[PDB]
Amino acid sequence: VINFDQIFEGAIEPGKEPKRLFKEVYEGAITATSYAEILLSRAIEKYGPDHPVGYPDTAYFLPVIRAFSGEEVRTLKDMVPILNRMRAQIKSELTFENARLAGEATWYAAEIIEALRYLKHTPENPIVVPPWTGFIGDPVVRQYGIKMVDWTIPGEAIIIGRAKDSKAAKKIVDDLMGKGLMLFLCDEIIEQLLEENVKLGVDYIAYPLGNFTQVVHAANYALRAGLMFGGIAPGLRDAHRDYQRRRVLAFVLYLGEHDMVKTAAAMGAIFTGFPVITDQPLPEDKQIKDWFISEPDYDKIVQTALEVRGIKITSIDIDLPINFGPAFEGESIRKGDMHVEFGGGKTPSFELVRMVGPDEIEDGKVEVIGPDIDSVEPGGRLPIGIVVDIYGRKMQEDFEPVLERRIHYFTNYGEGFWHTAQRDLTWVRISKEAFAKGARLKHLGQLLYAKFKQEFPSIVDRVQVTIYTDEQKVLELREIARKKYAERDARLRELSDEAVDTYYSCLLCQSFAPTHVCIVSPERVGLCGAISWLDAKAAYEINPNGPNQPIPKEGLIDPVKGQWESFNEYIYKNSQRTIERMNLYTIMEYPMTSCGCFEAIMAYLPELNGFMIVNREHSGMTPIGMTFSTLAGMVGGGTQTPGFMGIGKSYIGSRKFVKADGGLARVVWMPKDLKEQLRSIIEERAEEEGLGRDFIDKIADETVGTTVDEVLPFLEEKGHPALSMEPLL
Template identity: 60%
Template sequence: MSKIIATAAIRGAHKIVGRAEESLRQALETYGPDAPVAFPNTGYYLPVIYGMTGMVVEKVGDLVPVLERAKALLPPVPSEKVWLPYLGPALDAGMATLFADEIIEAIKYLGTPPYTMTSKPTDDNLWLGAADDVILRKRGIEFVDGTAPGFAAVVGAAPTNEIAVKIARELQEKNLYVFMSAETDGRSFAEQLAEEGVELGWETRLVPFGKDITATVFSLGFAARAAMSFGGVKPGDFRRVLLYNKNRIFAFVIALGYVDDEKYAQAAGAINFGFPTIADTDIPQILPTGICTYEHVVSNVPHDKIVSRAIEVRGLKITVTKVPVPVAYGPAFEGESVRKGDMHVEFGGQRTPAFELVRMRDAAEVEDGKIEVIGPDVDTVPEGGRLPLGIVVDVYGRKMQEDFEPVLERRIHYFINYAQGVWHMGQRDINWLRISKAAFKQGFRLRHFGDILYAKMKSEFASILDRVQVTIYTDEAKVLEMREEARRIYAHRDERLKALSDDTVDTFYSCTLCQSFAPTHVCVVLPERVGLCGSVSWLDAKASYEINPHGCNQPVPKKDVIDPVKGQWQSCNDFIFQNSRGTIERVNFYTIMEYPLTSCGCFEAIIVMLPECNGFMIVNREHAGMTPCGMTFSTLAGMIGGGVQTPGFMGIGKAYLASKKFIIADGGLARIVWMPKDFKEQMRHVLEERAEELGLGRDFLDKIADETVGVTAEEILPFLEEKGHPALTMDPLL
């Protein structure tokens, strides 16, 4: 290993550990040893420390032994005359640096935190700070399913804002997350992007953690939590945490500008995780392989090559289908918004008539690759103008089925949103689209909607589609005519879906996507029960199986009924037993009280028994507060996740609440006695309809307690009694 790098890293580690020692001394004097200390809304405490050592830090005094652990890891600074070129001391110094980073950053949260603690910057603060568990669950799954192939930790600043934007856009186009920290000569990469009007935040995958060099640890903390949350690694099993990251989290450091001792120390910490450093300056290199998959430090890389070189050094394989549009294209732009002042033209959104439709047609009716625009293009309207819009995608395929139409149609939202400067929301005839001024100036026109949909439909659904043809309508009379046809098709689909039930099919479908982090979990998707993540319906799973018969969605035969009320079939038990590695022997689909479906970790909400109220509470992932069962969502998730059966507790998708089969063996919707207020309002419309169907009355939701009533069973019980909640008169749960 390079003597210069090792010496610099060890010097830097001594500086940061010394800084942590001084911060801790001041915190003990100011706040005392019993002051609570934590990163916001996480069950992983200080995640690098927790993952590497298993040490739980809950108060300031708990940081003292952590600091001693960091100091013990520090090797002496090498002398000028004698040097043994061993990698071990530098790696130890790197880990000591990360421990010290977390001490410093945790103490910052004791006073007024310098961070927004939101998912995107505010008007007066660019820095987000540590990601909470809601973000971890939502974003971390993307590293498991391949939606996000990895992340780049960008440290420092580019020579110019223009170079910074080019690097960021290239990383986004590769679908990588960009975690930003530290500065060079007072300038940071995130500040450069913000100055150029680039939208930052988790939604655009450009995440500004903090300007301090110690904020770099938030990137490593995210990686450590991924190992514990999705890899099933136990806290303190440092070897498995590090190996999981080397083998599963494809991350790397891009060091921009002058690399000082503290940055060398951070790089040494990252190398422990198998994350190499690629620099734009002429620093010493570490080219032999060892801890990292390939080289450890590569330097003097030109800015136009730095992203591709970093991907190569990390051993990351990225397949990006080039979509022929004049703007950047990729999932990283899905969360980008186009505000009214930034738009060139908009369509729909109740401002003009609009719709979108996917139709299955006969072979003779579809000319593969044909894209036609009927009506005026966007360059015929003044800036800020409006046009009607109809998008019709006609498809033919030997394996295409009518049931797949809405599955493909929902993908229109994602495919169009992946274009930079193009914004889409809604579907069917309530869609709303905007094209930004910047995208228009780069040449984006209506035909490019067709280019996007043709390329993505053919690439993602190649196994079921042989021909795809796209027609874009902006002539208002034609849009109105075609919208009526679309509405007839929508109505026909709705009637078919209403007729689809658990009782009318002979096959359910599995989803084992999450087995990479919950090896014994087998999600089973029913017509009347959406997947726990909320994003996989029975039709989606069926379509997925047709598209890829060897994928994570497999048919589960429904034969040999054991208990029709609780929903247990022998064939389902056999499938689950085999695919849970012989762990789960039986499952009831319609109760959570006995052999419930296992939970992975990606569920949208959790349902929990409240015996004192003879009912159940439901808490959604977004709710950070306490609940009547005495646990927060994060704590509950940690308890029931990982593929275990936990009677009385179960993860669910939100849409399951409106199902006719919703915990029907336990009493159904009438058993719900508590849910967060915002969640209740979000679900109000569908739950009121379902309550009326059940004879509970449209005012049933107002009988359900929320956090404004109380967060303990004792607090909410008088409210339930006053409102005459039906759960109180039902048969006892226990």
């Protein structure tokens, strides 16, 4: 019933088909499928038809195939009928329909060829090294979903071929990274950007895939979105294409001299709804309106692609000397690249947002008080105290901690600006490159001002930013800040699931996970780990129409498992009626659903009488016989999964942590690093439960084993309480 092809209806008037383009696509699709045919036959000769084949760290087999036709490719023989089908759908008649089918066959061919390449890939002997990615694992797709759902990443650019010259490559890519687009790069443009010292790699959301058929690692990335968050069944071809067209705002930049295989791959992009913009001149018989178009002027090609795709960018439009955007949030500034640092146990530091009255503030006044960063030798240090005063008619003291959180992100988005921690434990660094470009502390203050005004227009009327660098002045002001921090800690201490009468929904991820609803209570953070009850409450109070809504706690059904009719009704209504009940204190019956951005996954193991937990960053097998990525393929997508649940890491430290299932006492296995990340809260909560602070050492981890038979003897020897608790079944 989904007629996806309707989006093409007006594109080409009959009898004027661009036969030059369609012949090139046909030749390239024949070439790609032939490449795959011969490599596959040779591989079956060498290894045998039953040899396993696949990609590293994915739940979705060969994802392009798994999405569009649903096959669970596991061995070489499985790909033989699939490729035979794709070659069969490549047809000489020069229609737009046959061109799109040839592009789909080209994507299938490139995916097959790449899986064959990975037949030689092992961790000890890998076929790709950073900053190149090749196939991108599921955890990376998931780790960036939270930035996609609110269009912090506004769209995706697939750049194929070669820019006119190195300098043009750096120009457009710097532009795109400042706009926050996710980049996929293929062929000679990568070396062009590295030659120009552009930052690239998974940490900068700018993926150097490789060359040639590695282009398909853009496609199998994009299609996993619908398979993961969208919950769309494998093989629902038009449903997947519709999800891509509506939610994955990707386009292709086709740079350099054209070639048949690159053109056929680009037509596969068009086949799933992504337009193609090339820097090459195009004769009338080699173009399609709004789908395969020429913009030779490098000063316009980015805006042209964004307009044809429908991407609208919000910019602060302050003249900063450095680039700014999500790609730089993940950067590290090594000591040898550091021009100056503040805080981090080297010098005193704090940051503070505070409400003030109308008379108390000069809107827009950004002032540095003390020496600036040109006063130190490179590698030097200064104190820093950042005070952001805010006035507004709708400003509340409650909002102060919320706004203060943003300083971290606001700072880290600066290229060559870096920030970690919070309050009086901040550590800030500024790169030598940023200093060389003219960055000074005034620019940090201006960035904070503009960003606070842009993000909170309805509660911020005046903003003033003062940055202090005198050591004794910073130490004096830090005590005022610490008074505010203690008031905030006391307000937090007053909260509990029982003491508040209203929990809050979070629908932010419904952009990509339409049936999923999060419920945030004081003692259960949202599964992303970034939205606590105070956060959701402030977000609603700032924007009553937004994706966080109050829900009264009314109509109790089960005090023990945590079920109320008010939450049941809200979830059912906002679930497209897929979900009727939710228990807040158990994973074993009506668990809360997940999108796919969960920091960790819990699962029950009957053989161990207890829970395993595994975080997204952990690589390795778990005692349930599944890696994190496989478990995540089951747990996400907005379906209810008794015995499994997605969670935020900090929820493990909550007093209400799966309380009806036994809480922390029920946890028998976690990765060693995750326990270390949470060691203090695990020790404190275990003491509160009566488990002992050494309970953390009774929790098995991968150094104990990855299977039940390795783990159970250790649990028995340790006298883990879970073995003597009631089975949860």
